[PDB]
Every structure is written in structure tokens, then in C-alpha cells.
Write a protein that binds this ligand. Structure first.
Ligand SMILES: Nc1ncnc2c1ncn2[C@@H]1O[C@H](COP(=O)(O)OP(=O)(O)OP(=O)(O)O)[C@@H](O)[C@H]1O
Lengths: 425, 230, 308, 148
RNA sequence: GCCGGGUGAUUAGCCAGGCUUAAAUUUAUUGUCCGGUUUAG
């Protein structure tokens, strides 16, 4: 049964039926959830026409890994940002209907006198479902105007919106893009100088930035404190007394109202915190997840990528925190690490966080679906590390489509022959 | 802005007929070599070159202080004389308003322009809406345009007339498509806020004739670009 | 009783008539027509089954709805020639025009006029009337009905609707020596006194708001004319002497066509086209054929007329 | 706005025990703060300042209403066309309403010429009315003005 | 006076060139397959 057919009957049932409980218990909802649960996100092919320096190009992408080898004047990066433009429209529509995305600026259309407009098109296959999108823009003063078609993307985003609207704890696709500037942003470890981590916080940008690592540190502290308090097993009666203290704070806010923009903002923030605490209590009633297990896994994958280091501990030492790594018989903070190790530390610590937040519920949140675009894979890595990076990326995250541009023969030798595309002038 | 079976009627030489004859010839010939040397394109270019831009007349109804009047403008110079509070700036604002839709449509078709602000309608009790009308006469050709806005709180609708200015803008775009260095008309406005720029960009490199169509009003940064251009 | 008559005349059963009643608004076809010049126009026309019942309906209401005698459109034994005979002997002329005239008539305003005339109708007939003469564009939940144009019943309905406006404006124009006439959505005024035509734009607006709310005046189609410029009323030129005319350009065109026909260089299509044009011009002037006969002879004219 | 607020409370009465009411407002503010913090403290200080109305206690001939009348009548001399200027409270906001002929006007809708005079004269009278708190007619101080 | 409108008549005729007449700064000939009007079969 195609997901489109399961979609239409649910639309009819929702229009007819009104009972929310009946809709939740409806068979159609279970069938739709089951079908959506296993559907490998996959990009089939993409064509570029008069964009930047490329005149015409049609390419097909593999479902697991594809390497773009072969230098040429047009530049490999243009393809990656071309895909980034297409992907930018999906998330915006997911957040809210009819939300705009990234347009093509008039200063990137080809300067040759022959051309008059530029267009990029691509197709997404989800099991048997097929959607296509074209983004186009004509030069200033042209006789004819061109417009994008967004019927397919809007239709695809509707089922995601509905699922989150009915069912809760649902998971959304992952889209990320690591440019070549990560060396600077990641290198800011030296000084470079929130409580309720929602799902849509990561659904704000696609390009890696400094603030991502800044958010990473705070996320680690929050997870550590939450895990430590849960492990200490604070009295359930004390927890209910904390809920009654939140009710007392709400009573104080009511007294403040029954006597102030700052006061109103503080009261709103306190009410939001109380609502988040109530939701956490509700999750705790169902035994919730395992904070210690997730905090262990996030450390474990990083240690998997750096075999020399023995262990990593937060070791706050009062103040705020001070992460310490044990190299041999010495202890060093992240500001004292090497240039090569920093890039791996930030990359893995960012991908792990994105999969943890984007995909809750699932027993192992490290088995999500998505697409990752990473450029210059062989930056600041000695040849010994260059022959093993692909194996670990394809083993830790087996269900994520990867697009990679390489530069050195060491990486090229390990990969097979059906996953390499050569661009020639 | 379309193709027809070339209705004949009586014989004439209007610019519109030459425009539609070229469009009719377009649907048959595909090779551009014949198109670039066809006598119809020569006729269209010759007719367009000798025409002189000229705003003919303007009428204001129930806009700002003015209740209803019609003005006829000379083709080379006209001067308005009055005291304070006699609606001298109102006329210039109305002209810039109707000229912005023509400015907008040249860059790209079906692009909006400037509307009427909700505080510009008259404050009288009996009013319901405000309107502005205009007329442009290039040689024999005549075009008209009407802009209107209903008073807030009313339940009756009024819309705009935009067929003439879209038809005129299409001729300019078509001519520019087949001429290497076609010219364009000039529209400018020097408001009272030009004294602020009395001596108070990522390495701009490419200069085109479409950068002067960004706005109808001279304000702020236009002085800086002048230095860069010089 | 009105629904009984329509059911009996077309021998419709209960289920069939009910089925047609709730699907009647959507049986319309939308198409484009070319424009004289550049552009296109939008038309919407019903099907064959709905047209011949609309025509039957208008026959019942023709002898019951009064129409003012200053409206010269869609009326028996009335045409353009009678419209231009009112202004044929005056100096100054002013012309105006409405804005989207045909889509501003709705059943809300239609039934209000029906109630004022003193005719009482049943609720079933009200339902039948509302769902038969009106068009519903957009989705099925729009709940908006417009009279439209291209339907056999719209032209008659508009004349009945504007009866109050015609009556209230005619007697005001009579007291100031002003002549008034309306054709569809065109209004014309004419007079001999100088500086008296500059006041009527406010009067028409006041009567427009007082009698038929919703309607409005297009302010970009107002024209003032005198005897020193071109004067015409809905397509007939007025000589300064005070005689109707067709125009010198067409007179010379028809003379050239006949001259070329005398040499046998006219295709069969142009024979029919020129014959129809000549017939219309002869009706407009009344002495066109005599002039043609006195120039090319009676034998050639008779042979040309009898051809085909 | 402050001038009008003190004008209605002091000169026009309609406040009963204004000192007692303002002191109770200060006490209520302190109680609310006890059961954003900087803003609450500033509000308490403002309430105490308003509670010092009896502390001031002048009610002289140069009251708030007299200053309001002097300011408006002074402005109206330079704008002979207008009739009256009033302050209107609506939609939780204040606006200035002018009368010209038979039409009501806001402040944004005036011309540039009357805007220049309104601003210049208003600021000139504001400085003298504010730096001479003891003159019977405070438009009688001393100074120097430069105009270009 | 000038200019801009009306047009009976002439011409292998939508040309062209002749003879009249009109005036506040003040027309730029429009939608069919429906409706009424003209003609014809
Ligand atoms: N909505 C309105 N209703 C009534 N009158 C208005 C409105 N908006 C403006 N006015 C009138 O407009 C007048 C000023 O108009 P405007 O600014 O055009 O004239 P101006 O002094 O000649 O112009 P400028 O000094 O800007 O060159 C004011 O006196 C005011 O009465």
C-alpha cells in the first residue's frame, strides 16, 4: 500500500470524524506511522543549467556514498551549495506552511550574453513516492518571467506536519553541511568568551557555525547535571514539592499581576519553564529515557574516533565546568589539544548531537535518516588516519546518505569503483 | 501583450499595429538571422525613436486636502506658486505614485509598486475612497492609469486599472531584447529631504543601466555611489 | 406559483428538477476572446440545457417589471440610431462610464427591488430564482453569486435594477436644460449652456450612493467635447451641421472596394463582408445606395447585389 | 504628558487623598516586589516620588493648570490659523489634536512650515519654563539665543 | 492670423491633389459563439 493512499483515507477520516481519541486510535494513523517509519530518504539525480560557471551538468547520486573526484575550473563547491539551495526549501515549509526559502540572487547568473535564465532541478525518491523540484530565476529586464514550482515539496512537507500534529515524539529528517571554514570556528576552543532543549532549535540553520559548538558545551552540561540528579535519585516527594514550589512561584506571579515589560517577560519565561518541568514529570511517569546511557554513548563515539585518549570526564570542579581528557598519564583541556584532533572532535560532537535531538524515542537514536554534505574530507589528517575515516563514518551511521569531495589518493584507494564520479573538462 | 490574427479594419500607422505585426511574424520564423533584419523590426525601432515622452494631464479626487481638480501640464516647463498649506507637495507625491508602477513593470512584469497610505485619505465624514488618474501621450499613442484606495472600515471594494502601463512596458522590453544599446526614459524626484545628504561597498565592479531603476527618489547613499562612479 | 409552470412546461419529474437545482450555478464554460488591438477578454457562457430555460423564464417576467424609457439597450424597436437622435442638436457633450458593472449585481440587491414593487412571491420560487439566474465562480464553498454577462437573462435584469437611478437623474437633468441617456453602462449628457456641465459629476455620485449601493464610477473614462473637436455617440459621428454620419474613412474604403470589384479582383469572402457593411451604412444614412448608383451605374450595383 | 497628569490631579482635584493613595501605591509596589527586580525597585522609587506630592505642597498661582494654559496660549500666537490644541487619550495612548477651520488634524499631517515653528517655539518655552522655577511669569529669565 | 476637427466631388481609388464650412485649454472609434437592431436566403 502506497503512502499516498494511506494519506488520502486519513484526510477523509479526519474531515469526517471529530473525536480526537478515535483519531488517535484509528487504524489509518497506525498504518501511516508504520509506512513512514521505514522510508530511506534518498536523492536520485540533479541537473544544473547556467548556474555560476557551470553551463550544463546532469549527475546521478548513489544511495549510500558518492565521491566527487577530479579537479576542474568550475569548482566542486558549487555543486554542494546548489544542493543546499534545494534542501533549504524543505525545512522552511516543514516549520510553517508557505514559508519562503533561499532565492537565487541575480549576481550569480551566468554573464555570457547567450544565457537569459538559470535553473536547478532535482528529484527525491521515498520508497515508491517521487517528488521533483525546480528553482529558477531570469535575468533583469527579460521578456519572459520564470517562477518556481513548489507543489511537490509542499505536499511532502504536509505529511510530516500532520504526523507531529497528531502523534508526539516524532522524528524529522537530518540535513547538514560542513564547509571549509570549520577550521576557524572549531579552532575557537581557547576562550571564545537553553534549559529546555526542544526539537526545532537545530531546525534553524544548515551550515556549521561557532555557535553550534557553544550550544554543544551547554547541552553537555545540562545532560550531565540531569543525569547526575536522576542517578542520585532525588525523593519523589521532594520532586512533587518542587512542582508545588513552581505553583508557589506562579502564585507569586499572580500576586505581581494583582498589584512592567521585564516582569511580564520573566513571568512568561517562568511559566514556560514550569510547563517544561510538567512535561518532564509526565515523561518520568513512564520511566522516561536513560540519561546516563545517552551521556555515555555521546562520549563513547568520540573516544571511538580518538583511540589514544583513555577517558573523558566533565570534571566541573565547581565554577561552570572544565572538560578534561587523559592523554597517557597527563590531563589536558580542549584548549590544549592539537589542530588535527579539534576538527574530529567538533565534527563528531556535532553530528551526534544532531541525531540525539532530531530523533528521540527510538531506542538507539544514532540510527536516523538524512543526508550529510561534507567538503575537503582530508583536512589536517596524516595518512594513517586517512585510510580509516570512511570505514568509521559508514559504520557508526549506516543509514545516512553521504556526499564527499576528496583530494588525495589515500582516500581514493579505499573506496570502490561504483561510487566514484570523475569530472573532466 | 499577445498575438492576434491581425485584424485589419482601416489602414493606419499606429505604434500598436507595428508592435502586433512583429508579434505575428514571430510565431512563424524561428531563425534569428531573418528576425534581426526584418523590415518590421526596423519600422518598430524607427517609430519608437522619434516619439517624445510627455505626461498629458492629471486629476486628483479626495486625496489629502485636495477634494477634486484636474491639471494640464506643459511639455517643457510648468511652475506651481502658492503659500504654505496649499497642497504643493501633494501634486508631486501623486505624480511619483503613478510613475512608480511604470518604473516597477520595466524590470519585471506583474511586479507591484506603491500604494496609498491609510492616513492620506481625506478626514471628512462623507468620503469613502481616494483616487488618482493620469495619461501619457507618446506621439499618437495614449495610455491611462488609475490608482485608488478605499477608506478603512468600509465594506465595498475598489481595484486598480493596469492594462495600459503593462502594454507600454512590454514594448520597451521587446525592443531591448533585440537592440544592443537601446535607451530608456528617465524618471527622478528631488524631495525636501535632499539637504541631509549635503556632505554628511564590497568593491563594486560591474556597472549597468538597471541600477538607476532601484528607486524613484534620490536619498542617502546615491551620493556615495556617485563618487565611486566618478 | 412559478415553479409549477416551469416543471409542467418542460415535463420534469421531482427528482430530476431537484438534481438540476443544486448543480445549475456550475454549468458554465470560461473562454478567452481576442481584442481589437492587443490583449484578450474573458467570457463565460452556460450550456444548451440551461439557456433555453433561462429564455423561458425571462418571458414570464417581461410584462411584470417596469423599465424606464431612457434606457436604450436590449429593448424592442430601439437601437443606436434612436440613441444618437437625442444629442444630435446640442453643442457640449460629456460622457462617463462605470466600473465592472455586471459583477456588482447580487441576489441581495435583486430581491430588495422585488419586495419594493409590491409583488409577493413564495419562498420556493425565491429559491428557484436564486439558484438559476446566478453564477458561482471559485470553489464550491465560495457562496458568492454574480449576474455575469453572456447569459440570456442578465441584460434584462440590469435594466430593471437601475430604474430608480434612471428616474431620479432624469428629472434633475430636465430642470437644468440637460439631456440624459444611458446605454448598458454608458451615460451621456449634452447641453447648449456654457459652464453647467462641471457640476454633474458630484450629483451622479450622490445619486449612485443613495439609490444603488456598491456601484462606483470609473474616473479614468470621463470626456468633455464641443463642436470644435470630434463628436460621436456609441459609434456614429455627428456632423457640426447636425446630421448623422459614418465617417469619411469608411466611405472612401467602400468606394475603393466597389471600384476593385468592377475590375474583378475581389474574393468571395470580401463580397459578403462588403455587402453587409454597405447594408449597415445604408440603414444609417439612408441615401448611400443612390450615391453609389449615380457613380457606377445601376446595372453594376444590381449585379453585385444579386451575386451569391 | 506629565504636565497634564499633574494638572488634572492637583488643579482639578478629582483625586481625594492623593498623598495617601500614592503612599498606598508605594506600599503595594513593595509588597508585590517582596511576594525585573531592578524595574520593580525603580517603580517603587517612582511611587515614592509621586507620594511626595504632599511633601512638595505648593498649590500656588503658578500651578500645573496655569503652566498648561500659558504654554498652549504661547504656541497659538505663532499659529493664527488654528483654533485650539488638545491632548486626547485613547487606545492606551496619547495624541495631539489640532483644529483648523472645521477639520481635526493630527501632528503627522501638518506641513513643514508649521512643524518648524511648532518645534522651535515649544523647545524655547520648555527651557525657560524648566530652568526658572520661581518666577511668577517664567518667560522672564535671561540668556542668549543664536539662530541661523 | 496660426493650428486642429466635419466631408460632396475628383482619382487602374484605402493614394493623391482640389472646392466648402466649424470654434472656452477640453474624444484617444470600443466584446463573440450570448442580447436586441439592419439586410438577405
Ligand atoms: N488627511 C488630511 N485631511 C485633511 N487635510 C489634510 C490631510 N493631510 C494633510 N492635510 C492638509 O495638508 C496641508 C499641507 O499640505 P502640503 O504639505 O501639500 O502643502 P504645502 O505646505 O504647500 O507643502 P510643502 O511645504 O510640503 O511643500 C495641511 O495644512 C493640512 O491641513
Amino acid at each position: 500500500m502506497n503512502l499516498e493512499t494511506c494519506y488520502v483515507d486519513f484526510l477523509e477520516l479526519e474531515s469526517h470524524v471529530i473525536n480526537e481519541d478515535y483519531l488517535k486510535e484509528s487504524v489509518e494513523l497506525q498504518k501511516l506511522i508504520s509506512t513512514l517509519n521505514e522510508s530511506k530518504f534518498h536523492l536520485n539525480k540533479i541537473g544544473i543549467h547556467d548556474f555560476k560557471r557551470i553551463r550544463e551538468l546532469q549527475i546521478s547520486l548513489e544511495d549510500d556514498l558518492t565521491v566527487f573526484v577530479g579537479d576542474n575550473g568550475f569548482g566542486k563547491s558549487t555543486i554542494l551549495d546548489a544542493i543546499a539551495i534545494v534542501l533549504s526549501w524543505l525545512r522552511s515549509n516543514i516549520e510553517k506552511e508557505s514559508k519562503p526559502g533561499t532565492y537565487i540572487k541575480s549576481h550569480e547568473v551566468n554573464n555570457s550574453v547567450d544565457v537569459e535564465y538559470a535553473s536547478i532541478d532535482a528529484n527525491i525518491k521515498l520508497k515508491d513516492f517521487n517528488t521533483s523540484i525546480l528553482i529558477t530565476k531570469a535575468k533583469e529586464g527579460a521578456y519572459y518571467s520564470r517562477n518556481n514550482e513548489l507543489l511537490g515539496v509542499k505536499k511532502l512537507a504536509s505529511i510530516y506536519r500532520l504526523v507531529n500534529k497528531y502523534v508526539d515524539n516524532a522524528s524529522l529528517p537530518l540535513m547538514a553541511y560542513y564547509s571549509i571554514a570549520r577550521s576557524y570556528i572549531g579552532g575557537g576552543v581557547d576562550r571564545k568568551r537553553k534549559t529546555v532543549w526542544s526539537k526545532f532549535d537545530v531546525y534553524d540553520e544548515i551550515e556549521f557555525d561557532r555557535n553550534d559548538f557553544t550550544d554543544f558545551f551547554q547541552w553537555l552540561v545540562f545532560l550531565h547535571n540531569r543525569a547526575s540528579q536522576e542517578k542520585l535519585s532525588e525523593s519523589q516527594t521532594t520532586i512533587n514539592a518542587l512542582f508545588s514550589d513552581i505553583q508557589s512561584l506562579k502564585a507569586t506571579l499572580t500576586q505581581l499581576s494583582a498589584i512592567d515589560s521585564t516582569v511580564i517577560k520573566g513571568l512568561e519565561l517562568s511559566l514556560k519553564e514550569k510547563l517544561n518541568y510538567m512535561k518532564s514529570l509526565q515523561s518520568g511517569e513512564h520511566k522516561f529515557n536513560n540519561a546516563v546511557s545517552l551521556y555515555d554513548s555521546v562520549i563513547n563515539t568520540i573516544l571511538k574516533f580518538l583511540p589514544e585518549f583513555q577517558w573523558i570526564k566533565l570534571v566541573y570542579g565547581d565554577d561552570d565546568y572544565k572538560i578534561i581528557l587523559k592523554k597517557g598519564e597527563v590531563e589536558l583541556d580542549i584548549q590544549q589539544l592539537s589542530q588535527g584532533e579539534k576538527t574530529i572532535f567538533t565534527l563528531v560532537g556535532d553530528l551526534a548531537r544532531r541525531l540525539i535531538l532530531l530523533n528521540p524515542n527510538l531506542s538507539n537514536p544514532l540510527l536516523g535518516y538524512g543526508i550529510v554534505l561534507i567538503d575537503e574530507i582530508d583536512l589536517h589528517l596524516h595518512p594513517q588516519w586517512q585510510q580509516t575515516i570512511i570505514e568509521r563514518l559508514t559504520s557508526t551511521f549506516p543509514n545516512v546518505q553521504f556526499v564527499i569531495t576528496t583530494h588525495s589518493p589515500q582516500v581514493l584507494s579505499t573506496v570502490s569503483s561504483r561510487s566514484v564520479r570523475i569530472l573532466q573538462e | 501583450m499577445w498575438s492576434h490574427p491581425q485584424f485589419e479594419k482601416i489602414n493606419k500607422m499606429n505604434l500598436e499595429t507595428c508592435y502586433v505585426d512583429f508579434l505575428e511574424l514571430e510565431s512563424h520564423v524561428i531563425n534569428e538571422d531573418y528576425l534581426k533584419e526584418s523590415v518590421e523590426l526596423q519600422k518598430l525601432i524607427s517609430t519608437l525613436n522619434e516619439s517624445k515622452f510627455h505626461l498629458n494631464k492629471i486629476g486628483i479626487h479626495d486625496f489629502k486636502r485636495i477634494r477634486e481638480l484636474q491639471i494640464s501640464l506643459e511639455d517643457d516647463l510648468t511652475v506651481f506658486v502658492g503659500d504654505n498649506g496649499f497642497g504643493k507637495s501633494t501634486i508631486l507625491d501623486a505624480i511619483a505614485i503613478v510613475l512608480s508602477w511604470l518604473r516597477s513593470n520595466i524590470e519585471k512584469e506583474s511586479k507591484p509598486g506603491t500604494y496609498i497610505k491609510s492616513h492620506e485619505v481625506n478626514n471628512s465624514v462623507d468620503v469613502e475612497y481616494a483616487s488618482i488618474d493620469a495619461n501619457i501621450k507618446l506621439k499618437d499613442f495614449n495610455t491611462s492609469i488609475l490608482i485608488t484606495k478605499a477608506k478603512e472600515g468600509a465594506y465595498y471594494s475598489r481595484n486598480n486599472e493596469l492594462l495600459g502601463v503593462k502594454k507600454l512596458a512590454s514594448i520597451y522590453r521587446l525592443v531591448n531584447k533585440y537592440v544592443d544599446n537601446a535607451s530608456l526614459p528617465l524618471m527622478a524626484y528631488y524631495s525636501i529631504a535632499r539637504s541631509y545628504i549635503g556632505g554628511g561597498a564590497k568593491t563594486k565592479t560591474v556597472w549597468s543601466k538597471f541600477d538607476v531603476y532601484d528607486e524613484i527618489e534620490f536619498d542617502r547613499n546615491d551620493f556615495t555611489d556617485f563618487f565611486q562612479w566618478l | 406559483q412559478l415553479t409549477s409552470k416551469i416543471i409542467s412546461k418542460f415535463n420534469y419529474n421531482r427528482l430530476a428538477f431537484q438534481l438540476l437545482l443544486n448543480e445549475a450555478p456550475k454549468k458554465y464554460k470560461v473562454y478567452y476572446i481576442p481584442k481589437r488591438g492587443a490583449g484578450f477578454r474573458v467570457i463565460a457562457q452556460p450550456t444548451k440545457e440551461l439557456k433555453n430555460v433561462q429564455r423561458f423564464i425571462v418571458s414570464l417576467l417581461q410584462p411584470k417589471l417596469p423599465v424606464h424609457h431612457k434606457a436604450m439597450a436590449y429593448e424592442y424597436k430601439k437601437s443606436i440610431k434612436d440613441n444618437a437622435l437625442l444629442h444630435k442638436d446640442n453643442n457640449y457633450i460629456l460622457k462617463m462610464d462605470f466600473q465592472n458593472f455586471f459583477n456588482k449585481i447580487k441576489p441581495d440587491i435583486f430581491f430588495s427591488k422585488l419586495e419594493n414593487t409590491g409583488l409577493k412571491l413564495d419562498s420556493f420560487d425565491e429559491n428557484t430564482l436564486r439558484n438559476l439566474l446566478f453564477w458561482r465562480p471559485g470553489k464550491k464553498r465560495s457562496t458568492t453569486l454574480i449576474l455575469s454577462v453572456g447569459a440570456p437573462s442578465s441584460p434584462f435584469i440590469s435594466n430593471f435594477v437601475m430604474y430608480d437611478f434612471d428616474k431620479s437623474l432624469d428629472d434633475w437633468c430636465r430642470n437644468n436644460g440637460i439631456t440624459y441617456s444611458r446605454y448598458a453602462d454608458d451615460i451621456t449628457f449634452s447641453t447648449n449652456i456654457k459652464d453647467i456641465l462641471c457640476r454633474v459629476p458630484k450629483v451622479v455620485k450622490k445619486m449612485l450612493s443613495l439609490h444603488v449601493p456598491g456601484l462606483s464610477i470609473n474616473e479614468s473614462k470621463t470626456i468633455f467635447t464641443s463642436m470644435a473637436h470630434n463628436r460621436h455617440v456609441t459609434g456614429v459621428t455627428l456632423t457640426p451641421q447636425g446630421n448623422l454620419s459614418i465617417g469619411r474613412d469608411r466611405k472612401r474604403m467602400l468606394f475603393a472596394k466597389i471600384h476593385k470589384y468592377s475590375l474583378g479582383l475581389l474574393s468571395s469572402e470580401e463580397i459578403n463582408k462588403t455587402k453587409g457593411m454597405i447594408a449597415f451604412a445604408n440603414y444609417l444614412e439612408g441615401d448611400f445606395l443612390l450615391r453609389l448608383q449615380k457613380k457606377y451605374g445601376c446595372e453594376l450595383i444590381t449585379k453585385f447585389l444579386m451575386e451569391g
